[PDB]
From a paper:
mutants of Glu129 and reduced to half in H236A. different role in proton-coupled metal ion transport. does not function as primary H+-acceptor. the pKa of Glu129 would have to be shifted upwards. in vicinity to the metal ion coordinating Asp51.
Author numbering: 13 to 506
C-alpha cells in the first residue's frame, strides 16, 4: 500500500552530526534522477545551440537546471514528509478516471524517453560494433535480462552504477573539451544571464536566441522524474516524529539532488561548448547521432590540429557512441521504477519488472522498427535523419503530461493539509514555484501546436495545416479542461 514496497525505508544512517558520511549513504536518488536529464534526446539541440550562438545560451542552461532543481526538490520533499509518492497523493486527492488519464499520459512520457534511448542505443551499436541498424534495435530489446541482473544488485550499488554512467558520459565529453583547449573566458562570459539570449535578431540556422532559450526553458523538467524522485526519496527510513531529523532529511536529499543535477548541467554545458569549440562554425549539418559521429570523425570539421589527428585516428566518434550507450541504459532502470510508481499509484496495478520492461520496450520499439522499415525500404536513405525526427516527435507526450505533474505537485506541497504548517513551502518558493509552473505550462501549451504541425514533416500541405491547427486547438483546450479540473479537486482538498 506504500510506494516502492521493496526498497522503501531501507537504510537509514544518520549518526548524530556526522553529516558527510550520512551524505555518502543516500547520495543515490539524486543520481538516479539526474542521469535522466543527460539523455541524448536534446544533445543535438545543445550542440546546435552552440554553433548558432557561441557560449551565449550557456546561462539559459543554468537557469533551466536551477528550475529543474527546484521542482525536483519539491517532489523529494513530498516523498520525504508524506512518506508517499506524487502519484499516490494525486490519486488520493482525485477520482480514478483522472488518475487513469494521468497514468496513460505519464506512461506515454516515459515511453517517449524510452524511444529516445532505444534510438540512441541502437545507433550506438550501429556505430561501435557496426551491427546492422535493424538488428541493433532488437538487440536493445534484450535489456530485460540486463534488468534481471540489475534486480539482484542493490541500490547501494545500482545508484552508484548510475553514477558510473554519469561520469562516463561526463568524462567522454569533458575529454574532447580538454583536447579542444577552449577560451574559458568567453565561456565564463556566456554563463552570465545576459539579455542577448532573449532577443530575436541573429537568427542563425533558422533559430533566434529567444527561440532556443525558450526551448531550453520549456524542456526544463521531465514529468516522470518527479514521481521518480518522490518515490526514491522514501528509500531512506525516517521516523517522521522528530522535526530536526526530517528537516535534516530535507537538507540531505536537497544537497544530493543539487549535487547530481549540477553534474547534468555540467554535461549540457560540455555539449554546448562541444558545439562551439570542438566543431567548426556550421560544420554540424546533420543533427543525427550518425551525423555527429562522422562529424566527429572528419578532421576538416574540427578547429584544432590535435582534434584533427585524433579525429582521423577515430577516437572522438567512438567515445561519442559509448556516451550514447551509457545514456541509453537509463530507462531500463528509471523507466521501470517510475512506471511501477505511476502504475501501482495511479491505477493500483501490481506488475513485476519482467512484463513492465517487456511491454514498455516493445511499445517503444514498434515505431522505431516501422521507421527503419520505411526508410530501409527507400534504400536506407535518410534513415538516421528519420530516426532523429521520430526521436524529436516523440517528446510531445512530455509536454502533454507536464502540467498534470508540476501543478498538482506545487499545489499539494504548498497546502498545509498535505505538508503541515511546519514543512510547507516558504513564501520564496511559492513565488518562484508558481512563476516556473506558469512559464512551463504556457511554453509547453505553445509547443503542442508546433510539434503537432511538425508531425506532418517539413512539407506544409495546405489542407493538412488547417487540420493541424484544429487538432492543436483541441489538444490544448482539452489540457486546459483537465488542468482546471485537477485545480478544482486539489483546491477542494485544500
Amino acid at each position: 500500500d506504500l510506494s516502492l514496497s521493496d526498497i522503501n525505508s531501507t537504510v537509514e544512517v544518520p549518526e548524530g552530526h556526522s553529516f558527510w558520511k550520512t551524505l555518502l549513504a543516500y547520495s543515490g536518488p539524486g543520481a538516479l534522477v539526474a542521469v535522466g536529464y543527460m539523455d541524448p534526446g536534446n544533445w543535438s539541440t545543445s550542440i546546435t545551440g552552440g554553433q548558432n550562438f557561441q557560449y551565449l545560451l550557456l546561462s539559459i542552461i543554468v537557469i533551466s537546471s536551477l528550475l529543474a532543481m527546484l521542482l525536483q526538490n519539491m517532489a523529494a520533499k513530498l516523498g520525504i514528509v508524506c512518506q508517499l509518492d506524487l502519484a499516490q497523493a494525486i490519486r488520493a486527492r482525485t477520482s480514478r478516471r483522472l488518475g487513469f488519464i494521468f497514468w496513460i499520459l505519464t506512461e506515454l512520457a516515459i515511453m517517449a524517453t524510452d524511444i529516445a534511448q532505444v534510438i540512441g542505443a541502437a545507433i550506438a551499436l550501429y556505430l561501435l560494433f557496426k551491427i546492422p541498424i535493424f538488428l541493433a534495435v532488437v538487440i536493445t530489446v534484450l535489456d530485460v535480462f540486463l534488468l534481471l541482473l540489475l534486480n539482484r544488485i542493490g541500490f547501494r550499488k545500482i545508484e552508484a552504477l548510475v553514477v558510473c554512467l554519469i561520469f562516463v558520459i561526463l568524462f567522454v565529453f569533458l575529454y574532447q573539451i580538454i583536447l579542444s583547449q577552449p577560451a574559458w573566458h568567453q565561456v565564463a562570459k556566456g554563463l552570465i544571464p545576459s539579455w542577448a539570449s532573449v532577443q530575436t535578431s541573429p537568427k542563425i540556422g533558422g533559430q533566434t536566441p529567444l527561440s532556443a532559450s525558450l526551448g531550453i526553458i520549456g524542456a526544463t523538467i521531465m514529468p516522470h522524474n518527479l514521481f521518480l524522485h518522490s518515490a526514491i526519496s522514501q528509500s531512506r527510513k525516517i521516523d517522521r516524529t522528530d522535526s530536526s531529523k526530517v528537516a535534516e532529511a530535507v537538507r540531505f536529499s536537497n544537497w544530493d539532488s543539487n549535487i547530481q543535477l549540477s553534474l547534468a548541467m555540467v554535461v549540457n554545458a560540455l555539449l554546448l561548448i562541444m558545439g562551439v569549440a570542438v566543431f567548426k562554425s556550421g560544420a554540424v549539418q546533420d543533427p543525427s547521432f550518425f551525423g555527429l559521429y562522422q562529424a566527429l570523425s572528419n578532421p576538416d570539421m574540427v578547429s584544432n590540429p590535435v582534434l584533427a589527428e585524433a579525429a582521423r585516428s577515430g577516437v572522438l566518434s567512438t567515445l561519442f557512441a559509448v556516451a550514447l550507450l551509457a545514456s541509453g541504459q537509463n530507462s531500463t532502470i528509471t523507466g521501470t521504477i517510475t512506471g511501477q510508481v505511476i502504475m501501482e499509484g495511479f491505477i493500483h496495478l501490481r506488475l513485476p519488472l519482467w512484463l513492465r520492461r517487456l511491454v514498455t520496450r516493445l511499445i517503444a520499439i514498434i515505431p522505431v522498427v516501422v521507421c527503419v522499415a520505411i526508410t530501409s525500404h527507400q534504400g536506407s536513405l535518410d534513415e538516421h535523419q528519420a530516426l532523429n525526427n521520430l526521436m524529436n516527435n516523440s517528446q510531445v507526450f512530455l509536454a502533454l503530461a507536464l502540467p498534470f505533474s508540476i501543478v498538482p505537485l506545487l499545489m499539494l506541497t504548498d497546502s498545509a493539509a498535505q505538508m503541515g504548517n511546519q514543512f510547507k513551502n516558504t513564501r520564496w518558493v511559492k513565488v518562484m514555484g508558481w512563476l516556473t509552473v506558469i512559464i512551463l505550462t504556457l511554453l509547453n501549451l505553445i509547443s503542442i501546436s508546433s510539434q503537432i504541425a511538425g508531425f506532418f514533416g517539413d512539407n506544409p500541405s495546405s489542407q493538412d495545416l488547417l487540420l493541424s491547427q484544429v487538432i492543436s486547438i483541441g489538444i490544448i483546450l482539452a489540457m486546459i479542461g483537465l488542468l482546471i479540473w485537477t485545480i478544482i479537486d486539489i483546491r477542494r482538498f485544500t
